[PDB]
Amino acid sequence: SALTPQLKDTLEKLVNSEKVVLFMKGTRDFPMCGFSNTVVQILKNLNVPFEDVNILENEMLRQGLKEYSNWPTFPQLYIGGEFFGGCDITLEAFKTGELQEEVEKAMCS
């Protein structure tokens, strides 16, 4: 395994600390990857507030999230403390309107 009871507890706490939490390569102002950039732009377009976490400077967290989310890469988007999806799924839910529905639901709880 790549995670422990404490790591899992912290991750659960981390993804629930804000309504929308984005795990990316780089920072919102300085995306290190095109895939990470697309999600940030999506989120900026919708005017939804969010927390961005750079996983390029913390391997334990990176490897733990891959297992926690059961998704091998980043970006990884969380909404309402539940894993929403990686790049492809976030882009599609954006075109579809499902992304917005999810965020609203989260913002209004």
Numbering used by the authors: 65 to 173
Article excerpt on this structure:
Arabidopsis chloroplastic Grx, AtGRXcp, was the first plant monothiol Grx to be characterized and plays an important role in redox regulation and protection against oxidative stress in chloroplasts. AtGRXcp is classified as a monothiol glutaredoxin with a CGFS active-site motif. Monothiol Grxs contain a single cysteine residue in the putative active-site motif CXXS and are conserved across species. It has been shown that monothiol Grxs have diverse biological functions such as protection against protein oxidation in chloroplasts, biogenesis of iron–sulfur clusters in mitochondria and regulation of iron homeostasis.
The crystal structure of AtGRXcp has been determined at 2.4 Å resolution. The structural model contains residues 65–173 of AtGRXcp, the chloroplastic signal peptide of which is removed. There is only one protein molecule in the crystallographic asymmetric unit. The structure of AtGRXcp has a glutaredoxin/thioredoxin-like fold with a core four-stranded parallel β-sheet flanked by five α-helices on both sides. A long groove is observed adjacent to Cys97 with a width of 11–14 Å and a length of 16–19 Å. The groove is formed by highly conserved residues present in plant monothiol Grxs and would be the binding site for glutathione (GSH), i.e. a γ-­Glu-Cys-Gly tripeptide. Structural comparative analysis shows that a glutathione molecule may fit into this groove, form a disulfide bond with the catalytic Cys97 and interact with several charged residues including Lys89, Arg126 and Asp152. In addition, comparative structural studies and sequence-alignment analysis of monothiol and dithiol Grxs reveal that monothiol Grxs (e.g. CGFS-type Grxs), with the exceptions of ScGrx6, ScGrx7 and GrxS12, have five additional amino acids (i.e. Thr91-Arg92-Asp93-Phe94-Pro95 in AtGRXcp) immediately upstream of the active-site Cys97. Most interestingly, similar to dithiol Grxs, ScGrx6, ScGrx7 and GrxS12 lack these five amino-acid residues and are also active in hydroxyethyl disulfide HEDS assays and have GSH-dependent oxido­reductase activity. This long unique loop with five additional residues adjacent to the catalytic Cys97 may be a key structural feature of monothiol Grxs.
